[PDB]
Amino acid sequence: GPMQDYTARAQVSEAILLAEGQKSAVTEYYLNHGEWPGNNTSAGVATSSEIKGKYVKSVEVKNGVVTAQMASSNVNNEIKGKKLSLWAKRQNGSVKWFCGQPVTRDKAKANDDVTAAAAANGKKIDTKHLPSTCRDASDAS
Numbered sequence: 001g002p003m004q005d006y007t008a009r010a011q012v013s014e015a016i017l018l019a020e021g022q023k024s025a026v027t028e029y030y031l032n033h034g035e036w037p038g039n040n041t042s043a044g045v046a047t048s049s050e051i052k053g054k055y056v057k058s059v060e061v062k063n064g065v066v067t068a069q070m071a072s073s074n075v076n077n078e079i080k081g082k083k084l085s086l087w088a089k090r091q092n093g094s095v096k097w098f099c100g101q102p103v104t105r106d107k108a109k110a111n112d113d114v115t116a117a118a119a120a121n122g123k124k125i126d127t128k129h130l131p132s133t134c135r136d137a138s139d140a141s
């Protein structure tokens with residue numbers, strides 16, 4: 001119902017905020033090297049398990065894709081342990097950021113494209129629990 005859906009959405013908003021804190025480091029890496037950072041340390045951000053909050057367990061950087069993982073003990077059943085991603089694409093004076101269900105990038109260096117995450121049993125936050133500003137499909141432009 002509406003109380004539950006609100007609770008979940010509010011919790012997911014914290015994951016987005018924590019993931020957004022990594023954007024500047026990820027972009028800087030890309031501009032410095034002409035390719036995305038493979039991992040958190042290369043990007044100059046904290047190890048993933050240190051990027052945490054009340055409702056957020058971790059934030060991982062993998063080939064420039066920033067993926068947040070919800071906690072399990074104090075979040076809504078439907079989002080426990082589930083994930084969302086942020087990723088960027090060059091516009092050729094700046095980058096544009098995207099946010100939605102989890103994605104991956106196979107290589108650090110191709111139109112900056114990403115693909116929908118393929119891990120079997122996928123733990124993707126349901127669309128209804130994503131903010132209106134975080135519903136991009138993997139193929140969005």
Ligand SMILES: [Cl-]
Nearest residue numbers: 071072073074
């Ligand atoms: Cl937990």
